[PDB]
Amino acid sequence: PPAIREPNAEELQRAARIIRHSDQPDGGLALTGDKALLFHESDDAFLMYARRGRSMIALYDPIGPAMQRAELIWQFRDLCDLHHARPVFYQVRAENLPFYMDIGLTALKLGEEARVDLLRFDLENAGAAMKDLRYTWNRGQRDGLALEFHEPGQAPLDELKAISDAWLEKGFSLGRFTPAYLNFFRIAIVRHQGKPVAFANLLETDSRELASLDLMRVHPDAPKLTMEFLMLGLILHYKAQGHARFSLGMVPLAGLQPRRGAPLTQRLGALVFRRGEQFYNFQGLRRFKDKFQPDWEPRYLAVPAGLDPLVALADTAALIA
Numbered sequence: 287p288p289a290i291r292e293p294n295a296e297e298l299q300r301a302a303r304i305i306r307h308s309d310q311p312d313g314g315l316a317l318t319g320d321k322a323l324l325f326h327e328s329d330d331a332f333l334m335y336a337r338r339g340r341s342m343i344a345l346y347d348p349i350g351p352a353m354q355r356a357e358l359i360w361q362f363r364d365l366c367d368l369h370h371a372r373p374v375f376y377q378v379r380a381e382n383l384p385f386y387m388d389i390g391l392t393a394l395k396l397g398e399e400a401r402v403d404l405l406r407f408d409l410e411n412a413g414a415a416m417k418d419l420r421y422t423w424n425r426g427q428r429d430g431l432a433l434e435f436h437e438p439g440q441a442p443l444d445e446l447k448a449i450s451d452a453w454l455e456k457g458f459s460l461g462r463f464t465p466a467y468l469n470f471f472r473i474a475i476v477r478h479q480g481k482p483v484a485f486a487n488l489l490e491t492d493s494r495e496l497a498s499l500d501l502m503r504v505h506p507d508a509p510k511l512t513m514e515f516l517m518l519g520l521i522l523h524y525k526a527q528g529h530a531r532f533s534l535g536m537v538p539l540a541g542l543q544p545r546r547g548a549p550l551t552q553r554l555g556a557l558v559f560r561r562g563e564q565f566y567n568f569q570g571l572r573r574f575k576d577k578f579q580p581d582w583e584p585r586y587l588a589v590p591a592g593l594d595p596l597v598a599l600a601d602t603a604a605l606i607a
């Protein structure tokens with residue numbers, strides 16, 4: 287069986303086209319080039335994945351139309367069997383579980399994704415959360431914070447490096463601070479009285495269903511408000527652009543409201559994020575995202591049914607680390 291390999295420049299351009307035509311901006315993670323790409327037999331869909339131990343671990347649901355996603359999942363099962371490897375899907379949506387169920391996988395809760403409904407979102411709405419946001423926006427501007435947007439390839443790289451350096455690659459589920467990769471994206475920069483203090487690359491598609499985040503890095507010496515200001519600014523930006531939803535990203539299990547007495551399928555997923563003698567607890571991450579009144583949806587780890595998931599969990603942990 288032919289060797290699993292990283293994509294070439296041409297394959298990446300094909301992925302990019304597919305992402306643009308999709309409603310799944312998070313497919314942009316493919317563009318780092320550190321994940322193998324499995325293309326649907328029409329180049330209208332793709333699945334991205336990496337190998338760790340005897341697991342082949344896909345990142346997210348496949349990118350593309352519904353039928354092609356379902357077909358790529360069966361393809362991937364075949365491909366894993368061909369390589370004597372177990373299939374694993376990292377961070378997938380509930381609506382696709384029946385497809386994973388059909389290729390013989392069960393699922394473990396991994397965490398929850400926060401998405402803002404941009405249509406219903408409004409700073410003048412009732413409640414304390416909006417009041418606090420209105421304060422952040424005004425105070426922020428009063429204090430010399432300003433958000434700017436750059437078309438792909440136009441952000442001043444060397445000013446980004448400064449920020450990125452102070453704030454510090456894990457890969458797979460994360461973007462890479464490289465020109466090659468960042469050149470694919472619109473980039474937002476927060477300046478404090480002219481000085482760059484945070485940035486974020488923006489994951490979009492040609493449609494306005496969904497925009498989301500990849501790298502978001504703030505200077506350690508930036509004003510405390512900087513990260514909230516940036517996020518609020520992005521939400522306001524995409525609301526104004528006519529986008530429907532904006533994704534704030536996932537909070538893993540241990541960062542959610544605790545649930546002892548919960549069955550193991552809703553607990554074992556924490557094993558993906560261990561830090562020495564301790565689980566990553568992601569303190570405050572959930573609280574921060576909740577500032578924007580998102581909606582929350584579970585994300586799952588799909589793993590072989592009937593078999594002890596510890597080994598798939600170990601492989602996923604190594605991959606994510």
Ligand SMILES: [Ca+2]
Pocket residue numbers: 372373390590
């Ligand atoms: Ca299996």
Ligand SMILES: [Cl-]
Pocket residue numbers: 417420
């Ligand atoms: Cl007010």
Ligand SMILES: [Cl-]
Pocket residue numbers: none
């Ligand atoms: Cl546009």
Ligand code: NA
Pocket residue numbers: 353354357
């Ligand atoms: Na088809």
